[PDB]
Symmetry: D2
Subunit: 113 residues, 4 copies
């Protein structure tokens, strides 16, 4: 089942006081325009050196080094680094996982269909 997130947010607030994130995926199109080639998150967490896994149509493309968190707080995942130098035809399913370096845990942060 599911549960309301109110108690979790206030528990988080009491512990960390201040938190701002924005994982709204901004998908970048490549060449040709029907190719998805990047995804950008406007405000990522910065407390650890997070890395990202990409899965295309059920195929695990693995993990690559992260581009930097930029001064505007954003972080870009370049799918060319994962897909042998190519973007991804936008008919495919794309899933992007962030990886917690303390555990190896994978959490979905972007999905395209």
């Amino acid at each position: 089942g599911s549960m309301s997130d109110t108690a979790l947010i206030f528990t988080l607030a009491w512990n960390v006081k201040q938190l701002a994130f924005d994982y709204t995926p901004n998908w970048g199109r490549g060449r040709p325009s029907s190719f998805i080639d990047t995804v950008t998150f406007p405000t990522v967490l910065t407390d650890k050196a997070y890395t990202y896994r990409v899965v295309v149509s059920g195929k695990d493309l693995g993990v690559r080094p992260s581009y930097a968190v930029e001064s505007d707080g954003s972080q870009k995942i370049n799918f060319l680094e994962y897909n042998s130098g190519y973007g991804i035809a936008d008919t495919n399913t794309i899933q992007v996982y962030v990886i917690d370096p303390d555990t190896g845990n994978n959490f979905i942060v972007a999905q395209w269909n």
Copy 2:
């Protein structure tokens, strides 16, 4: 025991995409200056009509109507409304709970000692 909040934040991020809060307590002093008379949170949640309970030195002063969330995102709790028109000597312990209107749950968001 305790647990790392990483998995909870990313689970929250996936669901709500964007969240910014700041419950760093800004304590206001009154008359005399050794009296605590308000507490202000710079960026509160706005998804529900949250209310606040105040407890002073183990005595539950109860719940009062909320002042508004202001255009800068802040919300003020005026202890005069709870303590029969008086501020609170700063030697006391003060605890402020936010109340989830869907459940009646109380969550600590500010403590003075």
Copy 3:
């Protein structure tokens, strides 16, 4: 909004390994039978000295000392202790909150209507 509890359960599992609870409310009827006089939880947490608040029809009856966690893992809340020695007519709304002694937080664990 809400979120799936899967990630929270597995995060909990990794940290505590083993957990069993059962807060299915067992409501006891008193004299007359149309009075609710107790509520029992079959398997409560035992890591802290939890206490309970009772609210009847919007009136906060406050907190009382806990009866013991029994050898079968159960814990009983006797509404007579909270309501001046009387049970509660079953037309009323009843809400039972458990209180975390580390924070003062109140969490709903039983509601009657």
Copy 4:
């Protein structure tokens, strides 16, 4: 940072009422005895068709079909299925992730070193 799990457990309790799990890893040794060949969890979740990924010394061995949840509530991960038919020398690091089929999320449930 970290946070106390009290609020999460009681939020879970209110929603699901009853929950029992036990992910204490029981490691099985193979042939020779210095090989780790299985890991068993005494009481797994059963609400979804969870699958497991195994990582040995930083190498992702991938995902395989799950053995069944047995009538005693247990579930076994046979490392022979993941490691080309072989157990794992117990000097290696082994990490077992459970995978949420709704999201693809990976959560650590067992680690050997």
